[PDB]
């Protein structure tokens, strides 16, 4: 084949630290989910979406890792191994949140960086829940990536 | 390019219009989530997925009225062709807490087909429902996740 | 058309049987959501996307059942009909479990089986709401899906 078609999803819950005095020594203290990453759902999903695509698996399989980018650029060079470069990608980040378009273009210049590929073969938006769900409570932030890989 | 993939996701929910008598004046409440368009979670989805693949961004930039989505869906494929694409089909996928749709299966892919000015045979829509769970489980709105094709004309 | 894209998403709610006397008389009883499937969201949501490409409408379309995997089968055989081969299939699991990955490929196996294509055009991933939402709360799995059909 020389198209290929990939999803991803990915959510990252909200956790927050605390320092504890305890036995005369100050200790963190982790609430809620327990981040192995920057918590960067964007790029999570996209890293799925173009191992999927390529049926490379998933980002659990890229290093037997908490900065998204580094993971997102190994599973963009394990698809060019396979002889693949991108078609498109489009991300749709799913979050209670206002304001995110002032960095929405910074996000595709950076992904295009890490893709090699242009800005304008990466699109990136930003939609609700309007208050329901777990990301409309504001307990975290998911996101949705679809990919389509060529054969170079 | 000559052929692009986008993605569209959408939840409308619930709110409720009530009339009130306040300081003698008839005035309008309105319960829940204050909405901004007629609520058309699957042309939403639709338009998102279509701006997606063309890398125009999203529904929030049609417009710089919503109150009718068709109208936003038809300016999206009007900015999509003006970058030489037309459709080569979009599946649509209604998330709802509901029994029969069916029947408003076809009128539905009808007008989206006649919107995108494609034949009816490159529209699909579909409804599922999440069996009592979550927020469309529990029947405080409803979501729609819609995928699309575009190609060079 | 020569290329195809569809999507697919299917949820499987909880539920467990409980056998009871009444009126002297042995009866199972059903807690929870009532099933009417084997509950597989992985080859519903298939089903649904390689059906939902073609414009065939969805899974709840075909027979007028206990086994997903006839269903899976019966959907490709209309697509067939219509002239389309899968070009490629990725799938998302979304559930509150770990250890699924020893199992991920033998159901790559079955789906290149029901799809008569290979196990490389066919990627299954799984990944977690890290605790929220209803798959986060362990009241039932999900499963995201996305397929790409060639004219055959």
Not at 54 to 78: C, H, V, W
């Amino acid at each position: 084949s020389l198209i290929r078609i990939g999803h991803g999803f990915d959510v990252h819950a909200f956790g927050e630290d605390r320092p504890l005095i305890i036995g005369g020594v100050e200790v963190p203290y982790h609430t809620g989910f327990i981040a192995h990453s920057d918590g960067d759902v964007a790029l999570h999903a996209l890293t799925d979406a173009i191992l999927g695509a390529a049926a490379l698996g998933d980002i659990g399989k890229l290093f037997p890792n908490a900065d998204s980018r580094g993971l997102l650029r190994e599973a963009f060079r394990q698809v060019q191994e396979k002889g693949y470069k991108i078609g498109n990608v489009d991300i749709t980040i799913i979050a209670q949140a206002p304001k995110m378009r002032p960095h929405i273009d910074a996000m595709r210049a950076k992904i295009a960086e890490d893709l090699q590929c242009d800005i304008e073969q990466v699109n990136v938006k930003a939609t609700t829940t309007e208050k329901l769900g777990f990301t409309g409570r504001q307990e975290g932030i998911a996101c949705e990536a679809v990919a389509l890989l060529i054969r170079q």
